[PDB]
């Protein structure tokens, strides 16, 4: 009867899968209605990342994890130019298959394609200098995000960091029924980061986006 459809958590995840089943495995697909914002997104990510990697006490540059990778847009444009290797994790086999083509030029530097939902994924223990989490945290419930962030801490090499990049609402938590995601406000997101046992090393707001867009923020965590 209605016992599954009324399980909000179950439907939240199921509806997100149904959405991504129809998203093309292309940069435009990854960017939703905003392909023109890929360029300022990347530039901001490049500027932020470089402040937290390299040299004394700062993260290493050997291996990164691209969480909610999709086809690997962040891996191609942000991570692979900095790290000696990368791994991807995404729930969609479709995107991870296409990633092998999208990332072919550096295909030998992509050590694993992990097909998991993040709420069911344990980042390999102490494997990564950076764990990058972009435009996927809003697809986890608060309890699942909290637990995933805690697991991510255990995925870090010495001096490693997590970089979280996502939309941040003015107030509350706002559900988007179309893609089955939530936008969290700053207070809620920062609370979940704190409750996970992480501390914020730095933060920066995304510049160059339209005034009509939800604000986007980057956080460096450890």
């Amino acid at each position: 009867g209605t016992s599954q459809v009324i399980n909000g958590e179950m439907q939240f995840y199921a509806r997100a899968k149904l959405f991504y089943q129809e998203v093309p495995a292309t940069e435009e697909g990854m960017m939703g209605n905003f392909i023109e914002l890929s360029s300022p997104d990347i530039q901001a990510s490049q500027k932020f990342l470089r402040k937290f990697v390299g040299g004394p006490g700062r993260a290493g540059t050997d291996c990164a994890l691209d969480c909610g990778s999709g086809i690997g847009r962040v891996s191609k444009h942000v991570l692979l130019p900095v790290f000696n290797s990368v791994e991807l994790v995404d729930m969609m086999e479709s995107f991870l298959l296409e990633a092998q083509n999208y990332l072919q030029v550096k295909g030998d530097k992509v050590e694993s394609y992990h097909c998991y939902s993040l709420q069911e994924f344990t980042p390999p223990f102490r494997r990564y200098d950076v764990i990058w989490i972009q435009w996927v945290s809003g697809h986890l419930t608060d309890k699942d995000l909290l637990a995933f962030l805690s697991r991510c801490r255990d995925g870090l090499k010495e001096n490693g960091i997590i970089i979280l990049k996502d939309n941040v609402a003015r107030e509350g938590c706002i559900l988007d029924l179309s893609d089955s995601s939530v936008t969290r406000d700053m207070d809620i997101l920062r609370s979940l980061i704190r409750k996970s046992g992480l501390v914020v090393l730095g933060q920066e707001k995304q510049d160059g986006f339209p005034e009509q867009c939800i604000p986007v923020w980057m956080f460096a965590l450890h």
Partner: peptide, 5 residues
């Protein structure tokens, strides 16, 4: 992705 809102 980005969003409007």
């Amino acid at each position: 992705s980005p969003k409007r809102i």
